[PDB]
């Protein structure tokens, strides 16, 4: 997208979202990132929404094909492998944008935490499909990214901040589903929920709605896990 203006790429990403054209939306936002300027809060959200939709469809397809493969010529494995390779390619693309150079140029806590949460998520999606020599290393990469995000978030954000809350939610999912640490997942989700609940009194009506929506998700996991 090198010949398109940054502002036009951002405008088109917004149009692509309204049209439910998430692959286009991701390509527009990748082009925007590659212009080399830092991203605003709204632009970070467009980038994240685009790729979460793309990889979400791939993950759902991969789970369907993997289930069929587990229940049973080479066609099912071949097709599962092609969807898997495509999913890994998208994750690698996102990780490459974060490494060149979104994270290193992100100095305030809001931006850096956002990108490190992304990094943990995309390594987590790689871990979901990993089986071999690098499954352990991929899991550690996800852990390290989430942990650094958590350390900054606890130092620099209030406990009701929605990015801090979503980070803790996803890290708890990492512990439960990837790292075989359900007790760590439960402890993290409970502590996060309780510390947020104690801070709600400081919030406006609108912020209260933002925070409680994510706190509910923590609760729904705790209900499924306990």
């Amino acid at each position: 997208m090198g010949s398109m203006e940054r502002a036009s790429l951002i405008q088109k990403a917004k149009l692509a979202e309204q049209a439910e054209r998430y692959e286009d939306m991701a390509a527009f936002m990748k082009g925007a990132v590659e212009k080399g300027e830092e991203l605003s809060c709204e632009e970070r959200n467009l980038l994240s929404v685009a790729y979460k939709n793309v990889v979400g469809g791939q993950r759902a397809a991969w789970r369907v094909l993997s289930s069929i493969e587990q229940k049973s010529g080479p066609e099912v494995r071949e097709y599962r492998e092609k969807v898997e390779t495509e999913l890994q390619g998208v994750c690698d693309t996102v990780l490459g944008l974060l490494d060149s150079h979104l994270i290193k140029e992100a100095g305030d806590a809001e931006s850096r935490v956002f990108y490190l949460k992304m990094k943990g998520d995309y390594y987590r999606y790689l871990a979901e499909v990993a089986t071999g020599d690098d499954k352990k290393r991929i899991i550690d990469s996800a852990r390290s990214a989430y942990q650094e995000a958590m350390d900054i978030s606890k130092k620099e954000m209030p406990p009701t901040n929605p990015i801090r809350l979503g980070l803790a939610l996803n890290f708890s999912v990492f512990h439960y589903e990837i790292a075989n640490s359900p007790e760590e997942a439960i402890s993290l989700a409970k502590t996060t929920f309780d510390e947020a609940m104690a801070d709600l009194h400081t919030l406006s009506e609108d912020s209260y709605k933002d925070s409680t929506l994510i706190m509910q998700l923590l609760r729904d996991n705790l209900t499924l896990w306990t």
């Binding site: 917004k14 979202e17 994240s48 979460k52 939709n53 979400g56 979503g166 939610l169 996803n170 729904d220």
Partner: peptide
């Protein structure tokens, strides 16, 4: 489940 994260 994780953050849905699929709507801006």
């Amino acid at each position: 489940g994780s953050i849905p994260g699929r709507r801006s």
